[PDB]
Symmetry: D3
Subunit: 217 residues, 6 copies
């Protein structure tokens, strides 16, 4: 009743039973009629107007990123290409945890609230062109968990890396895929799954490997 | 500014290894914005909660000084986290207190010098008057939960939940605005990534895990 | 089991089992953090600044009215003194329903939400200087139920009467005893209890009596 | 200026016996106020409910014309309220429709000529573009429930609840702002006090009750 | 840099160096996410619903006014036709200052903020079917500066005149060309350029001439 | 209603020559409106500024009585505006004080009798204080009218001067004497009274005199 490492050993490191219970950790999303939701809407409008700036351009690009391209999207901040060909050890580490962070860490809350997404709410398109399950953001969770892991491998560039991971979430806000509160919530959950990953042997093996590789080149 | 070279028992890192909170974090909600209007509403909600059972716990958490944070997780952890019952673990959590509470917040804290709720309303709390953004206490509470969860995964949810509530207590008690604690969790989770690159931290972590298995 | 006609036959006409379930009828009160509550606060401030006007004076007076003085507070609008001495039949009718409207019709919701009152919320006094059970307003409910009944007796003055009853609630808002949403809710509930009263034999007896008296 | 002297089957009262809604009711929330900001948020909430089960019921209630209102209480009442199964009762409720829906709202409705949600957003509804405040339908729905509750006290809560929800349906469906229906309940309850002073109404009430007892 | 009296002596009295620094005088416009902007939006909605009333009709008419028709739009309030044929001295005065108020006094701030306009923001048309440079309003500045000048010529009708000038700005709000804060800002700037105009010799010459003319059309 | 015929030294105009502020100005924001919500937020922002340097200047400007307004522009003007250093100029600005502070505000001020911030919050100010007649601000009107006049005399420093005049109004906001909308309204009315002043012979005489004096040095 839900994919995990025993169904897709290449996309997950953990089992359903090792997942963070996002439903119990996270407060509910702002309800329409609240001042907090009024803020989500205002942030949506701000993001919308940014769609035409340079920042909006980068946003449209980040919205194209599928789960698999997330790792490579940190090459600039990391300081070297994160590709299967230039760093297979590292590329393997980040790819096998994608759904631990994007799915297992968000599933519970995502399916209970079934929150509607901005574009669906306004019945308008997004900046780059599942109308529910908006809260919390799976992509943002993956983006942020990846940054935390990457920062441990290259502490010398933790700030650039952390910043990049943070902006990946904001791009979804600017592009209309999520409400601001959806991404803020995703960072709580995405940081939590990283703690669990550190208790997983396979993850630990790849981490050491990826670090050796890093020292290597 | 203090760091491991000045208080080796409260910090693991050096000033140069600190997360630049000023450049990571967006600025706090400015008065006149809708976001701040929400911070105020959350302060009122917290105020009315002061009289409930949740408010009682809140007052208790507000008494926690940096040193008592570790022991405040005993219930969630499943066993007493004290120097006497778990010196290895108690040593691990205590030596990182300021890495999370100070280094990870300093930069943004000193630039914004945000006023605190009780100071803003000129009223007391449930238990300085600036440097409210982000919350140092919340950062320490959350960094500690992330570490503790790695040692005892079987109780990660109880632990993570307790750590999350430590922050909310400061909101209910009037020490911080909601946005102050939300910000603190971003920064607190970040300092944990750096700690994992520090040899001394790594030594104690292993030690604490061994002790736990014992 | 709380008070009702079997414990205070002079303040109630109905039994606990005949009460309107306010908890199930009414939506919950505006939660702090919502736009609605922001409006309740704004109305509180408006009322506060009115405290110094003539309307504020009347407000302070209405806040002095205990459940028993409510009936007589309609004399002006009714067009004649509503007192035990000048109209005992009418005065008896209105008095015996006071808690049917002020208590039975509000109890359920009032005890579940235990909503804090404005003056308590701001830790300031009121204009006529219980801190919970604010939603819905028992007083407003009684005031409004009384107006509906009184209007049936003197249709020629229904508007003056209905208007006075409406203002009784607003005085509580201006004086700081209730949030606006507390009185709005009370009028739904107060009008409901009147439907039940019309099925009660004793009420019906006094109603006819009160009308006969009015004719004489 | 219709009233009992023009449509004796839709009204019980005369223009001169009508509640002056304009003088009773406060004005509707003005755009630019916090109150209106709340009306809009409730509109959005109702909009998103349009796809749930509650939204389905809402669409159905929006189909109800003044004449179907009485029958819409059958479930809550506990028995079919139709001309064939309860002509006495069905006659009572039908002849008061415009006393509640028109006379008790007219004054304020024509003075404010408030725009409706769907017109405001230039979008369709879930099922006139002015005279939104107060809601005539809600007033009729609420006055009917108050009357029906007097006939069957044993089910006053189901009945009162149904009547309340008829109004909310118009909110969810986009026909009215929340403040429009809240106002309608004040006015709809008032007209019921007047009806109780009307002889014809009193005759039918007794008749309807007798019928209920026989039934 | 841009146009001024040395490039279009018939639309400006002043030089770029004599311009009010609107960027340094004015506070920035309400940012989206602030309560102030929430108010700008509410006023936009109010104006939108007015589009169908009589006030909305006048609004649509005022939105047709190009910079050159502004002077004549005060004829009713002024009490007599302000046209080149009926009052060439006055008509010349008001026309030669159009860009001093509409451009020089707004340029700086207008180009820095490049504020989006309501109709563009909502992606809907206006009531009189550039998408930026909305803050402050050039038109409102010209409308208000003209009223201030006209009021000095005919003090007996200053209130009607000032009122008309004020309403020209509000029409843009009702019609969707500007946010309320854009026109409020314009009046600060428009009133300032009038102070400078009073130091300009050519302006002073025409002002006297226009007043003389005003005295003669009476008898 | 005082005017030039009762205090020829404080006014240039007569009651009949006054701008009808009530008819020109829109009403002040009503409590319960979004606009008022903004006035309150600006009051809070000003309050927190009271402890900064800008707050210090604010407190000083709040001490300014109508008679000290002229001299408060010396720095911006570029030279001391005093009876001893520039009696012609000092006489010009002083005799118009109530034209701007009273005649141009009277009508609307007395009709709305708007409560002031400090009174509203029942707290003190930043500096026996009037509690109503807040809208529009008489002080701001005088401050702004003075700036407009002073800018005509010294165009070379119009921006410094206009800026100073604008800030005089903001000080009352920061200090709690007025709501933001009170000072915004005051600048419309203050600029209008300046148009009338230019039609007044006495004013015209002193203006020329003041300019001559300015050229003199």
């Amino acid at each position: 009743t839900g994919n995990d490492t025993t169904t897709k050993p290449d996309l997950y490191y953990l089992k359903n039973s090792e997942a963070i219970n996002s439903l119990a950790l996270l407060p509910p999303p702002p309800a329409v009629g609240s001042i907090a939701f009024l803020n989500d809407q205002a942030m949506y409008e701000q993001g919308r107007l940014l769609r035409n700036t340079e920042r909006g351009k980068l946003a449209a690009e980040d919205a194209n990123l599928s789960s698999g391209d997330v790792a490579n999207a940190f090459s600039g901040a990391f300081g070297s290409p994160i590709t299967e060909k230039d760093a297979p050890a590292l590329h393997k580490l980040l790819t096998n945890m994608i759904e631990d962070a994007g799915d297992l860490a968000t599933r519970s809350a995502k399916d209970h609230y079934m929150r509607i997404r901005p574009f669906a709410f306004y019945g308008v398109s997004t900046c780059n062109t599942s109308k529910n399950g908006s809260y919390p953001s799976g992509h943002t969770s993956t983006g942020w968990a990846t940054a935390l892991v990457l920062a441990e491998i290259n502490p010398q560039r933790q700030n650039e890396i952390l910043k990049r991971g943070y902006e990946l979430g904001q791009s979804r806000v600017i592009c209309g895929y999520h409400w601001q509160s959806d991404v803020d919530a995703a960072r709580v959950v995405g940081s939590a799954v990283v703690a669990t990953l550190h208790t997983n042997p396979a993850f630990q093996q790849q981490l050491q490997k990826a670090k050796a590789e890093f020292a290597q080149h």
